[PDB]
Design a protein around this ligand. Sequence first.
Ligand SMILES: [Mg+2]
Ligand SMILES: [Mg+2]
Ligand SMILES: [Mg+2]
Ligand SMILES: [Mg+2]
Ligand SMILES: [Mg+2]
Ligand SMILES: [Mg+2]
Ligand SMILES: [Mg+2]
Ligand SMILES: [Mg+2]
Ligand SMILES: [Mg+2]
Ligand SMILES: [Mg+2]
Ligand SMILES: [Mg+2]
Ligand SMILES: [Mg+2]
Ligand SMILES: [Mg+2]
Ligand SMILES: [Mg+2]
Ligand SMILES: [Mg+2]
Ligand SMILES: [Mg+2]
Lengths: 78, 112, 93, 139
Amino acid sequence: RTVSFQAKESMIRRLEVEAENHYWLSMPYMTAEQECGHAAERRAQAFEAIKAAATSKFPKHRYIADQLDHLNISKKWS
Amino acid sequence: KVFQPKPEDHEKYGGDPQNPHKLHIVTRIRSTKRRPYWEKDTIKMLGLQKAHSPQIHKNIPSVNAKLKVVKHLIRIQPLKLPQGLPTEETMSSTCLKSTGELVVQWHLKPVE
Amino acid sequence: AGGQWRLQQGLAANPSGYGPLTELPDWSFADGRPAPPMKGQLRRKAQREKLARRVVLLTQEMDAGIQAWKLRQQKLQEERKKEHDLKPKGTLL
Amino acid sequence: FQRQKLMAITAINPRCLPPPPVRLLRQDIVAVFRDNRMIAVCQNVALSAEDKLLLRHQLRKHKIFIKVFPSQVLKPFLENSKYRNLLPLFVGHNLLLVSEEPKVKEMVRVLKSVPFLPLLGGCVDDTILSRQGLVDYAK
RNA sequence: UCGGAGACUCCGAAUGAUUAUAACCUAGACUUACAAGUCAAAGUAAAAAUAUCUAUUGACCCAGAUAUUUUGAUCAACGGACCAAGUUACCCUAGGGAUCGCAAUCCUAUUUAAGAGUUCAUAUCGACAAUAGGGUUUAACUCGUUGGAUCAGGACAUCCCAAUGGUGUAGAAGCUAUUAAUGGUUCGUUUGCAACGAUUAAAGUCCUACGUGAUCUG
RNA sequence: AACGAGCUUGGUGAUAGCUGGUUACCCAAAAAUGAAUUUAAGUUCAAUUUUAAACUUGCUAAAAAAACAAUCAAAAAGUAAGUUUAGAUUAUAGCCAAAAGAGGACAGCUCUUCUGGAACGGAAAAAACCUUUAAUAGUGAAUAAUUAACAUUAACCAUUGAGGCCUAAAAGCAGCCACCAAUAAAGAAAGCGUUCACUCAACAUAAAAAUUCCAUAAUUUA
RNA sequence: AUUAAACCUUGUACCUUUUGCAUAAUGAACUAACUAGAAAACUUCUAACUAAAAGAAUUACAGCUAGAAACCCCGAAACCAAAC
Ligand SMILES: [Mg+2]
Ligand SMILES: [Mg+2]
Ligand SMILES: [Mg+2]
Ligand SMILES: [Mg+2]
Ligand SMILES: [Mg+2]
Ligand SMILES: [Mg+2]
Ligand SMILES: [Mg+2]
Ligand SMILES: [Mg+2]
Ligand SMILES: [Mg+2]
Ligand SMILES: [Mg+2]
Ligand SMILES: [Mg+2]
Ligand SMILES: [Mg+2]
Ligand SMILES: [Mg+2]
Ligand SMILES: [Mg+2]
Ligand SMILES: [Mg+2]
Ligand SMILES: [Mg+2]
């Protein structure tokens, strides 16, 4: 089947977008060595929050007022 | 070789080989559907779930490696700060242009 | 219609993006008292504010990273150049 | 289908443009003029090859030769030589009746052997003249 | 069933010979559905450390043996029912279905022609090759709807009618080719379809789930 | 009044790895690979999946270096999952496209391995290809795939000593061996002519398959 | 949707079933009534008392006692007994 004209234009535009993405990824701000350890502190704190949530699972408090509140269903006007 | 720039490439895109930009503006332009499972994961790792939603990422080698895997599914535009980085006072008045400039003052008035 | 042109002008390709048309309030009171902020704008402000904070955090982390790299190259540089003790020779040392 | 889609994706005519910008035969024409004093120009009558030979051979018995050269290569010397009025004559097939003696009358007589062949003119005794003049000199 | 080799084709086994005879106990691991099968430090004990290759399987139950240690399967359908064959068109039920390679010679066809050749409406054939076909040797021991009658619809790759080219077309018979789907395109005998006899301008080739069994029939 | 072995009652609610069926709303997560089996219309285990609980590193990536594009994997970084314990099933036939082997160091075909998919949009057809992060009200908006394609030939001239030879005798010549000579330029000639004795090449040369086609239409407005 | 019942636009019955596809293949003329998930070994949740719990015999190196929470329907060819 013949390749449509509009189809060729569409893919050519997509090729240009991806080709430019090569350019912007060719200029690393920091080298490999300079990266090591720069974000260690933030990562460690994030994991600690994850651990705290996992080990905080436990049942909930129970109150006499909640259970005694059921008696209010029979409230009336004198 | 693909990621080694050429002198003409710098002129076309107007980017200096020195003083490289720091932050990428990355948006998802195409679907993860019908893509290999590994490409699906990288998109979610980078946070590009909703298309046409810009996300700020570091221009560092580790991030670049992941960004290259999904090179075909996204558009990368260098972030620009004409008026400098936002401060605490101006943090609530920021606005990102389609051009890629994060202005720190948004008045909604004619420029004049 | 005409979306590429709006980008050349620096506007949002969609007219329903960032602009006075959407972000400005839709109405006020007759007396002039401003109306409560529209729910949509409050959500939109949060995303920019949240995005703004991420920009600040990432730059600070990257800047501090290379500074530490500078300290490493220095402390290591001075460590390499070192000497101690004494260095005789010949038939006795 | 995308595979086919990818495959399709992957000033002045030289015509109107202006175009960038015999020696052995020359001696032969000079040789006949030097060797033969009189050159008579007669139109080549397209005679049969066998009949053409005997006329040349018969003249050879009379020590008279027949010489023929292409007209276009013959123009230059005829332009600058003792014989200059033969240029219009030397158009189309032609023959030269060349001899060592001024046998102008006998040349016509040999020409009269074939009545259809006419004589256009030439030079006799190094003097260029037309046929009407040649007949007067032949007397 | 097991294992060796090749990438399904081949080889072996339910191990034998050699063995101055090979303990017990116990860290960590391999393998693996399970069950089974592998290697082993340390400690301890005999003696003066590993039997030797090649490789080799069978559970539980239950029966045997002995003075406390051991043995029982072509259970080979090899995860093994303690012990059971045919036959059904006389059949039945529950359902599911459908209704290309190489070689080895030998033939041939076209292009080769090594050769010979050839001799007044007088000649070529053809080694050897190349190429297309058909067989043979070369690798285990039987077969899978449809005539006819009635009515026909369409295709043209035209059987006849019609219009033409060429001719090795004198006239008369023909042969070769193109265009054309207009109407037509037989009756019987032997009878399982294949022949046959008489004719015709011709007795076309095919498709329409045997074209067509709620139209009929073998 | 249907005998390969009567009928009625009872056993009996016979049994069926087989066929059929199995009744309100809402939210959420969610797969036909390995092993054995009188096993392949079944079941059991592994693997997967799931609800809860415990506590801590997990996924992508993973430099050098091994054993040779993988088996393995360290600092990092992007990011939130992974391991263990208790409980529990159904499932164990795929379908199609695109890659790579392997069967005859083939294509195909049958397998095996990896990848992807299951529109309301698009592709004459249209679960499988391409565009598509869930679902909600609005007489808002920007967009994706795609809406087919305009892609070389000619009319010109043609010379003897008949070379001898078995073919009277062979002229460029039936024929056979030589295959020449002059010539501006000619092959004992290309055919032809000729029992011997019209012209091409040369020279000279203007050029080069079966019911009935099947949207309609349209060459130029930036 | 509409001013307007129909014209205009959009739209390949249902269930079961096959692969996660049907223009298939099963089943339904329609109405009313009837017509198919049932058990507590292990687990989870909730309480009583607690080195003990249980209204006799049971269990226990935090247990023990009680509560709640679970596993369908229709259909053969046949086989045997005894009458007719
Ligand atoms: Mg085991
Ligand atoms: Mg030891
Ligand atoms: Mg068996
Ligand atoms: Mg077995
Ligand atoms: Mg086994
Ligand atoms: Mg019988
Ligand atoms: Mg019988
Ligand atoms: Mg008919
Ligand atoms: Mg025809
Ligand atoms: Mg008859
Ligand atoms: Mg019928
Ligand atoms: Mg699998
Ligand atoms: Mg079976
Ligand atoms: Mg079964
Ligand atoms: Mg019915
Ligand atoms: Mg039953």
